[PDB]
Amino acid sequence: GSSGSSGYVCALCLKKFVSSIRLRSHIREVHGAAQ
Ligand SMILES: [Zn+2]
């Protein structure tokens, strides 16, 4: 396997973030996966 990508990226909007949490909540406010 190959390595590279360090940061985290959304699975829907495909947007990169600073940390995991910052991305998690983003999906709850932007994507709101708490339906
Ligand atoms: Zn997103």
CSV table of C-alpha atoms and ligand atoms in Angstrom, one decimal:
chain,number,residue,atom,x,y,z
A,1,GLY,CA,0.0,0.0,0.0
A,2,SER,CA,0.9,3.7,-0.4
A,3,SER,CA,0.8,6.5,2.2
A,4,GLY,CA,0.3,10.2,1.8
A,5,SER,CA,-3.0,11.8,2.8
A,6,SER,CA,-2.6,13.0,6.4
A,7,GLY,CA,-5.6,15.3,7.2
A,8,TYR,CA,-9.2,14.2,7.1
A,9,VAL,CA,-11.7,14.8,4.3
A,10,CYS,CA,-15.5,14.6,4.2
A,11,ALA,CA,-17.2,11.6,2.5
A,12,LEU,CA,-20.1,13.6,1.1
A,13,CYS,CA,-18.9,17.1,0.3
A,14,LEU,CA,-15.3,15.8,0.0
A,15,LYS,CA,-14.0,18.8,2.0
A,16,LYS,CA,-10.7,18.7,3.9
A,17,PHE,CA,-10.6,19.6,7.6
A,18,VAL,CA,-8.1,20.4,10.3
A,19,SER,CA,-9.1,17.5,12.5
A,20,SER,CA,-11.5,14.6,12.7
A,21,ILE,CA,-14.0,16.1,15.2
A,22,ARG,CA,-14.1,19.3,13.2
A,23,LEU,CA,-15.1,17.2,10.3
A,24,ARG,CA,-17.5,15.0,12.3
A,25,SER,CA,-19.7,17.8,13.6
A,26,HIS,CA,-19.5,19.5,10.1
A,27,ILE,CA,-21.5,16.5,8.8
A,28,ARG,CA,-24.0,17.1,11.6
A,29,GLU,CA,-24.5,20.7,10.7
A,30,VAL,CA,-23.8,20.8,7.0
A,31,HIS,CA,-25.0,17.3,6.2
A,32,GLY,CA,-27.0,16.7,9.4
A,33,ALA,CA,-26.6,12.9,9.5
A,34,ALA,CA,-28.5,12.8,12.8
A,35,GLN,CA,-31.9,12.4,11.0
B,1,ZN,ZN,-19.2,17.6,4.4
